Amino acid sequence: MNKTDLINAVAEQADLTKKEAGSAVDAVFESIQNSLAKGEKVQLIGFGNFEVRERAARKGRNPQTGKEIDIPASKVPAFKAGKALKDAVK
Amino acid sequence: MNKTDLINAVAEQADLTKKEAGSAVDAVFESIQNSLAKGEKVQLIGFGNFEVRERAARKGRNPQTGKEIDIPASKVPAFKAGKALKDAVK
Numbered sequence: 001m002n003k004t005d006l007i008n009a010v011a012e013q014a015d016l017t018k019k020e021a022g023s024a025v026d027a028v029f030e031s032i033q034n035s036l037a038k039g040e041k042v043q044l045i046g047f048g049n050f051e052v053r054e055r056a057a058r059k060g061r062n063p064q065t066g067k068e069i070d071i072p073a074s075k076v077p078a079f080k081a082g083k084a085l086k087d088a089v090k
Numbered sequence: 091m092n093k094t095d096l097i098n099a100v101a102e103q104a105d106l107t108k109k110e111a112g113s114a115v116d117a118v119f120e121s122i123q124n125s126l127a128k129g130e131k132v133q134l135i136g137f138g139n140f141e142v143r144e145r146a147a148r149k150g151r152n153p154q155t156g157k158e159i160d161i162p163a164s165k166v167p168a169f170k171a172g173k174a175l176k177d178a179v180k
Binding site for chain 2: 001002003006009010013014015016020021023024025026027028029030031032033034035036037040041042043044045046047048052074075076077079081084085086088089090
């Protein structure tokens with residue numbers, strides 16, 4: 001299922017024009033992105049949580065060389081599924 | 091941002107009533123949950139992918155009996171962030 005497929009599912013289930021569902025789906029994910037960009041956690045009851053995980057600078061190793069490498073600090077997005085999603089998948 | 095806040099953000103950006111936005115938000119998460127429940131990946135350009143990850147079957151030991159046990163394989167939700175979401179938080 002890709003974004004267009006998802007927009008068609010929303011149009012159908014929420015009874016919206018394809019254009020309105022398109023606007024809504026764009027808004028959902030841009031809102032989650034804009035929240036995480038400001039460091040704010042997203043808590044979606046009955047789906048899951050989005051947050052930003054911080055990792056510090058670090059020493060590591062290239063898989064193919066064996067060389068010591070510097071691993072810089074990073075901020076990456078993280079998703080934590082909730083029970084409804086976990087139970088439906090298992 | 092919680093689900094109520096997300097619905098309000100969606101109503102604002104997509105210019106929908108709070109009830110329309112609430113229906114759309116519910117439809118997105120229901121449709122992602124339903125896709126993954128069928129083992130089907132959700133590919134959202136820019137944002138990322140929701141997939142099903144299998145945890146392999148494995149062997150354990152009962153600490154009482156000392157006998158080998160079988161831990162069955164299981165499926166869990168997984169999320170893999172895309173370039174737009176990663177670049178928004180780095």
